[PDB]
Design a protein around this nucleic acid. Sequence first.
RNA 1: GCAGUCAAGCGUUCAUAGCGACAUUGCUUUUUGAUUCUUCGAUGUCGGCUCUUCCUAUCAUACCGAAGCAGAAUUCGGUAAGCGUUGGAUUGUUCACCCACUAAUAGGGAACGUGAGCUGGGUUUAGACCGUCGUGAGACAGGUUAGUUUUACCCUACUGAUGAAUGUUACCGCAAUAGUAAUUGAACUUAGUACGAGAGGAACAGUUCAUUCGGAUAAUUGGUUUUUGCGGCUGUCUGAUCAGGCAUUGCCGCGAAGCUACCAUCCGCUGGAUUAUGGCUGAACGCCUCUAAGUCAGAAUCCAUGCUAGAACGCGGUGAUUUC
RNA 2: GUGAACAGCCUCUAGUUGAUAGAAUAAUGUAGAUAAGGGAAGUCGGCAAAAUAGAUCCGUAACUUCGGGAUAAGGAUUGGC
Lengths: 386, 136, 78, 59
Amino acid sequence: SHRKYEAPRHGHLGFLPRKRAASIRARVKAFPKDDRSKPVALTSFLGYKAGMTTIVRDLDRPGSKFHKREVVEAVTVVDTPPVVVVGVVGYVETPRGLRSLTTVWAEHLSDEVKRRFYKNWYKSKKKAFTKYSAKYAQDGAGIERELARIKKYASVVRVLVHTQIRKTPLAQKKAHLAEIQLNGGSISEKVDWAREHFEKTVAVDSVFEQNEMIDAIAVTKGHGFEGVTHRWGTKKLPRKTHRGLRKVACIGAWHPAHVMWSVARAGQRGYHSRTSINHKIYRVGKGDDEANGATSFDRTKKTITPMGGFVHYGEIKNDFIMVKGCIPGNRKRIVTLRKSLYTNTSRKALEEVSLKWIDTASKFGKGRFQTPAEKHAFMGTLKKDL
Amino acid sequence: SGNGAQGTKFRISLGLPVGAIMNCADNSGARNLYIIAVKGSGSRLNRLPAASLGDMVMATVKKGKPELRKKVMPAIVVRQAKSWRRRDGVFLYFEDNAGVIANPKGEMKGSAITGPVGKECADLWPRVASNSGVVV
Amino acid sequence: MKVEIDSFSGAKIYPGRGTLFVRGDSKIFRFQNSKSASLFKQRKNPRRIAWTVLFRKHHKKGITEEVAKKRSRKTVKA
Amino acid sequence: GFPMKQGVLLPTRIKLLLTKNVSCYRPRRDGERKRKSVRGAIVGPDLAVLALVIVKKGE
RNA sequence: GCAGUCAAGCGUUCAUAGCGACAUUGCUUUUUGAUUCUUCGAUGUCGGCUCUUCCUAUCAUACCGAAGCAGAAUUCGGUAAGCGUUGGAUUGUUCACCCACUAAUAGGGAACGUGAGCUGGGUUUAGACCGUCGUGAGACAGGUUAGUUUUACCCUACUGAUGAAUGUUACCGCAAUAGUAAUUGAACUUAGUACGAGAGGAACAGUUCAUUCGGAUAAUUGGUUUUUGCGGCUGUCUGAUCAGGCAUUGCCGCGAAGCUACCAUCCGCUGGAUUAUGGCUGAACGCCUCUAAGUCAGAAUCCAUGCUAGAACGCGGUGAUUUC
RNA sequence: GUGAACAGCCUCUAGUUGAUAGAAUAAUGUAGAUAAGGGAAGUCGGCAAAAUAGAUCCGUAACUUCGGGAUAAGGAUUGGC
Ligand SMILES: [Mg+2]
Ligand SMILES: [Mg+2]
Ligand SMILES: [Mg+2]
Ligand SMILES: [Mg+2]
Ligand SMILES: [Mg+2]
Ligand SMILES: [Mg+2]
Ligand SMILES: [Mg+2]
Ligand SMILES: [Mg+2]
Ligand SMILES: [Mg+2]
Ligand SMILES: [Mg+2]
Ligand SMILES: [Mg+2]
Ligand SMILES: [Mg+2]
Ligand SMILES: [Mg+2]
Ligand SMILES: [Mg+2]
Ligand SMILES: [Mg+2]
Ligand SMILES: [Mg+2]
Ligand SMILES: [Mg+2]
Ligand SMILES: [Mg+2]
Ligand SMILES: [Mg+2]
Ligand SMILES: [Mg+2]
Ligand SMILES: [Mg+2]
Ligand SMILES: [Mg+2]
Ligand SMILES: [Mg+2]
Ligand SMILES: [Mg+2]
Ligand SMILES: [Mg+2]
Ligand SMILES: [Mg+2]
Ligand SMILES: [Mg+2]
Ligand SMILES: [Mg+2]
Ligand SMILES: [Mg+2]
Ligand SMILES: [Mg+2]
Ligand SMILES: [Mg+2]
Ligand SMILES: [Mg+2]
Ligand SMILES: [Mg+2]
Ligand SMILES: [Mg+2]
Ligand SMILES: [Mg+2]
Ligand SMILES: [Mg+2]
Ligand SMILES: [Mg+2]
Ligand SMILES: [Mg+2]
Ligand SMILES: [Mg+2]
Ligand SMILES: [Mg+2]
Ligand SMILES: [Mg+2]
Ligand SMILES: [Mg+2]
Ligand SMILES: [Mg+2]
Ligand SMILES: [Mg+2]
Ligand SMILES: [Mg+2]
Ligand SMILES: [Mg+2]
Ligand SMILES: [Mg+2]
Ligand SMILES: [Mg+2]
Ligand SMILES: [Mg+2]
Ligand SMILES: [Mg+2]
Ligand SMILES: [Mg+2]
Ligand SMILES: [Mg+2]
Ligand SMILES: [Mg+2]
Ligand SMILES: [Mg+2]
Ligand SMILES: [Mg+2]
Ligand SMILES: [Mg+2]
Ligand SMILES: [Mg+2]
Ligand SMILES: [Mg+2]
Ligand SMILES: [Mg+2]
Ligand SMILES: [Mg+2]
Ligand SMILES: [Mg+2]
Ligand SMILES: [Mg+2]
Ligand SMILES: [Mg+2]
Ligand SMILES: [Mg+2]
Ligand SMILES: [Mg+2]
Ligand SMILES: [Mg+2]
Ligand SMILES: [Mg+2]
Ligand SMILES: [Mg+2]
Ligand SMILES: [Mg+2]
Ligand SMILES: [Mg+2]
Ligand SMILES: [Mg+2]
Ligand SMILES: [Mg+2]
Ligand SMILES: [Mg+2]
Ligand SMILES: [Mg+2]
Ligand SMILES: [Mg+2]
Ligand SMILES: [Mg+2]
Ligand SMILES: [Mg+2]
Ligand SMILES: [Mg+2]
Ligand SMILES: [Mg+2]
Ligand SMILES: [Mg+2]
Ligand SMILES: [Mg+2]
Ligand SMILES: [Mg+2]
Ligand SMILES: [Mg+2]
Ligand SMILES: [Mg+2]
Ligand SMILES: [Mg+2]
Ligand SMILES: [Mg+2]
Ligand SMILES: [Mg+2]
Ligand SMILES: [Mg+2]
Ligand SMILES: [Mg+2]
Ligand SMILES: [Mg+2]
Ligand SMILES: [Mg+2]
Ligand SMILES: [Mg+2]
Ligand SMILES: [Mg+2]
Ligand SMILES: [Mg+2]
Ligand SMILES: [Mg+2]
Ligand SMILES: [Mg+2]
Ligand SMILES: [Mg+2]
Ligand SMILES: [Mg+2]
Ligand SMILES: [Mg+2]
Ligand SMILES: [Mg+2]
Ligand SMILES: [Mg+2]
Ligand SMILES: [Mg+2]
Ligand SMILES: [Mg+2]
Ligand SMILES: [Mg+2]
Ligand SMILES: [Mg+2]
Ligand SMILES: [Mg+2]
Ligand SMILES: [Mg+2]
Ligand SMILES: [Mg+2]
Ligand SMILES: [Mg+2]
Ligand SMILES: [Mg+2]
Ligand SMILES: [Mg+2]
Ligand SMILES: [Mg+2]
Ligand SMILES: [Mg+2]
Ligand SMILES: [Mg+2]
Ligand SMILES: [Mg+2]
Ligand SMILES: [Mg+2]
Ligand SMILES: [Mg+2]
Ligand SMILES: [Mg+2]
Ligand SMILES: [Mg+2]
Ligand SMILES: [Mg+2]
């Protein structure tokens, strides 16, 4: 017949299929355009999502009814100890797309990455890379030939980095390895940079800075098998209805005589890949800085960790990125921060922030105190104690 | 919102869907206001239009002077009850739902407003500012 | 940035946090949480609820060093 | 411009009944009292002016 | 039902801005008839709920050409279905008809979409009242009230989920093909300006917000409570006390964690090619013409960028590869 | 025992402890509950659900066959010692 009343579809066809992602490490499907005039640097970074908290800052938006007033804002924090560089991989342009032609590895590989190449570490003879490592013995010659080849050919150079998971409260020991496109100028300069950085270490301040707009690439929280109502935001059917009501009443017309790809159905929910963009960096933390969670306006020596510590995560004892708002994925997940694909002029992006205050109270209840110092002050002396 | 509303308004939690009755908080003779429409509200199958603080509604007077009853007129929501959240981080709420009868341009029919008035409404409708005591 | 305080319980309310209630008169009451908030709606009297400041004050609990002497005076002669 | 009044506590303003012989009120008539706004005795950034008296001289 | 051709007329004058008689040529298959091919060893009526997709004869939104276009508003026409198209009162209704919001509240198809998807109000069995007709049993395309809505575990489709074999195993990647997404409004300002005798009265650039939609997220606030976590209460049972049992989780206030809400917060990209249309140069046709050759500018379109899958019979780089 | 009580709930005497079992706790169900702000806007229709409730005291309309309507309506109160 014809609908009756018009309404928009439930849910976005551009995020199909709604199946579980192929890996907890969401893929970077694109990197920034290359500007080979600038210095060589990474274009993304690995970290772990730890938690959120609240911020207060004064706003700067000439014209807003909130210009020059304080706002309070949710932000998230991602643990970010220096990534360590261990390979370069060199790609070439073909009429069938980008194809990698070599990979050169550092001579010494940390147990952390080595562990990544294995399914049962405890039993294994840990032989990974033990013949590659030899290639260095000899003067250096075949590793030069490779490095050399990459320079000769190669349209784009990526770096194999991995995270220092041990520098993180996680149990999980096996580190995360991944390719990061290098955008500083000249294919040769790029590989030189790469080669120079083997076994050597790279920190976030070398990649991100205050007020930058960055993207988060990560696998979404999982939910298992979801009915149609919650998964697609379909209307609940009425109370009166027999044989269940969190459903879709009509699964299709009679012709085409086939349930169609575009109707909502029960199925997996969450644990999807997502490339969320335009998240402002409101803080770039330093792990060797007491007074991490302190401010120009605050002053009190205290770190970003909440009282009792980040619920379900732990402590934060390294550099971190504090991103305004909230990000795909959950507490503990490997998450990739990426440079933005365009130069946003937004004004909203561009505004330069300065935190006045960072919340620091326990998130494990309705916290009343920032430091244990403050808590003793307000509360008095207790039956434990002095 | 709309006519005579100088200013924009930041979104605030919708408290009052159509059918809701708020206290009349002016001295017009009206005792309550029954909401039949919100101005500037959009469309989605099955959704009630619903007002908030400093929204202009279209109401009738269920209780009040007979010269005010049996007809539809503009009013402005001045107090809420559904809690909402300001950009200074605060979740706040009044003890009653209440608004004041008004003209399309936004002029009060009455001359006083009894009780407090949320600032977001005061900021929105100058003749409401005028007649307000305690704001927020 | 001001740290307001719980008009039921006496707690510090750091920014964006708990709720604010504007009563009939226009008396504003600020709560740190649903607890102070509910005890409040329940017409509970804070001086009878052991954990509140107000209750502690009235019952002279753990003050000790405030009612312990200080030292603040001078001597001129010009 | 509202004056602080020792003894209130409070970092806010309140309205008090005031009497003969008191701060922030000079009565117009015998046994007149006025309900008047007054500022708390606890310093905040809402003050235009702090009033201090030197007790010890510095270096 | 929709759309043309002729052009007598209408339109102050003026056929064709906008219309159009007498005639006349068509198109459509959500009208209704006409037919009786299929189905009477059965293809479950009407409406509404829900949900998808498609058509265009386009209501809104983008860009345009016309005007009996000064401005504002409106009317006519093109490219256009990318994207929207609602909340109520009465009625079983579809339809109708008012109220009200709105950018707009377009029209249609999909077995007059959609009952092992719902509902069961109407229609259409058996009870029953009335009116009309009948001697009567009974009838009525008249009114009224009450009247059981069955089955999926199969196949396919669809949604998600594993997985043998292409030496083994592991890590990092490519990208064919497929999907794809954002939408609309207001205020400030431009500006009481352009236009106008006046009454009136815009727009581009800039700013702040908002609607509808989408993807997440849980600092905060709120909801949930078998944290049976802490406290309280009734009845009884353990001789009292302590401390407990039982009352299908006995009851109550608070209640962390988790889940979760436009009831909460955050985020939703920018290049090219084009349509209509306005043009350049320019012959045909010594004049003239945006067009024939060649060519510029151009839209909510399109193709990319970007975003989601990743071919389980598409592929690359790399690690280690067993001997009693 | 509680209580108006052969009600409900708890207990003594007697009698049972029979009803396939284990591991998890997805969708959708069945049965049991709760929800901020609004309050029937849902729907043929308030269907379902919620609200009310004992007892003591106060107070109680139209209309009526004078018998009622009437727990009309509407209020207060209730433990322990
Ligand atoms: Mg339609
Ligand atoms: Mg409708
Ligand atoms: Mg890509
Ligand atoms: Mg504003
Ligand atoms: Mg690639
Ligand atoms: Mg090779
Ligand atoms: Mg293992
Ligand atoms: Mg799960
Ligand atoms: Mg569920
Ligand atoms: Mg049923
Ligand atoms: Mg549905
Ligand atoms: Mg489908
Ligand atoms: Mg742990
Ligand atoms: Mg918490
Ligand atoms: Mg928590
Ligand atoms: Mg009044
Ligand atoms: Mg509806
Ligand atoms: Mg009446
Ligand atoms: Mg509320
Ligand atoms: Mg006045
Ligand atoms: Mg005032
Ligand atoms: Mg609560
Ligand atoms: Mg809570
Ligand atoms: Mg037609
Ligand atoms: Mg004429
Ligand atoms: Mg003419
Ligand atoms: Mg003609
Ligand atoms: Mg013809
Ligand atoms: Mg024909
Ligand atoms: Mg036909
Ligand atoms: Mg028709
Ligand atoms: Mg036949
Ligand atoms: Mg037939
Ligand atoms: Mg048959
Ligand atoms: Mg059949
Ligand atoms: Mg059938
Ligand atoms: Mg049958
Ligand atoms: Mg003319
Ligand atoms: Mg004109
Ligand atoms: Mg006009
Ligand atoms: Mg045309
Ligand atoms: Mg055109
Ligand atoms: Mg379409
Ligand atoms: Mg199409
Ligand atoms: Mg739309
Ligand atoms: Mg309608
Ligand atoms: Mg209706
Ligand atoms: Mg009529
Ligand atoms: Mg209109
Ligand atoms: Mg048909
Ligand atoms: Mg049908
Ligand atoms: Mg069917
Ligand atoms: Mg059936
Ligand atoms: Mg029926
Ligand atoms: Mg029936
Ligand atoms: Mg019958
Ligand atoms: Mg009949
Ligand atoms: Mg019937
Ligand atoms: Mg019956
Ligand atoms: Mg049925
Ligand atoms: Mg079966
Ligand atoms: Mg089947
Ligand atoms: Mg399948
Ligand atoms: Mg073999
Ligand atoms: Mg002006
Ligand atoms: Mg004027
Ligand atoms: Mg004129
Ligand atoms: Mg998110
Ligand atoms: Mg959601
Ligand atoms: Mg509870
Ligand atoms: Mg208990
Ligand atoms: Mg109790
Ligand atoms: Mg007892
Ligand atoms: Mg004792
Ligand atoms: Mg027992
Ligand atoms: Mg029992
Ligand atoms: Mg129970
Ligand atoms: Mg849950
Ligand atoms: Mg919001
Ligand atoms: Mg949303
Ligand atoms: Mg945005
Ligand atoms: Mg995008
Ligand atoms: Mg192109
Ligand atoms: Mg040209
Ligand atoms: Mg020309
Ligand atoms: Mg010629
Ligand atoms: Mg052309
Ligand atoms: Mg041409
Ligand atoms: Mg030609
Ligand atoms: Mg677009
Ligand atoms: Mg781009
Ligand atoms: Mg992508
Ligand atoms: Mg293939
Ligand atoms: Mg494959
Ligand atoms: Mg297969
Ligand atoms: Mg290939
Ligand atoms: Mg391969
Ligand atoms: Mg290979
Ligand atoms: Mg008994
Ligand atoms: Mg059995
Ligand atoms: Mg049993
Ligand atoms: Mg079992
Ligand atoms: Mg369930
Ligand atoms: Mg509710
Ligand atoms: Mg409530
Ligand atoms: Mg009510
Ligand atoms: Mg209704
Ligand atoms: Mg009503
Ligand atoms: Mg309805
Ligand atoms: Mg209905
Ligand atoms: Mg009915
Ligand atoms: Mg009806
Ligand atoms: Mg009925
Ligand atoms: Mg009712
Ligand atoms: Mg029913
Ligand atoms: Mg019922
Ligand atoms: Mg209740
Ligand atoms: Mg009665
Ligand atoms: Mg009563
Ligand atoms: Mg007593």
